[PDB]
Amino acid sequence: ELKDYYAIMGVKPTDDLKTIKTAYRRLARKYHPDVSKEPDAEARFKEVAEAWEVLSDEQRRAEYDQMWQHR
Known part of the structure; x- marks a missing residue:
């Protein structure tokens, strides 16, 4: 199950930390x-922040992206 952080954080599913x-x-x-x-x-913020962890975490974004498009 992917938490659409990028979504949470109102972003792109294939963008960078910027x-x-x-x-x-x-x-x-x-x-x-x-x-x-x-x-x-x-929750949403925490969703962002957690997204933002992933998204701002080479690992969490990696794992995040792993479940998302990087399956």
């Missing part, structure tokens, strides 16, 4: 629960 944080940063920015305007940013 997009991802652009995504998770704009996300985590719109998702940081102290300030976020989403149905569930505590």
Whole structure:
């Protein structure tokens, strides 16, 4: 099961950390629960942040991407 981080973080499924944080940063920015305007940013942000881990983690993005397109 792939958590569409890239999605979570409103990003691209085949982008790099520049997009991802652009995504998770704009996300985590719109998702940081102290300030976020989403149905569930505590979760969504954490989804980003966790996406963002993956996405910002050569391994988690790797594993993340592994389940996603890198099967």
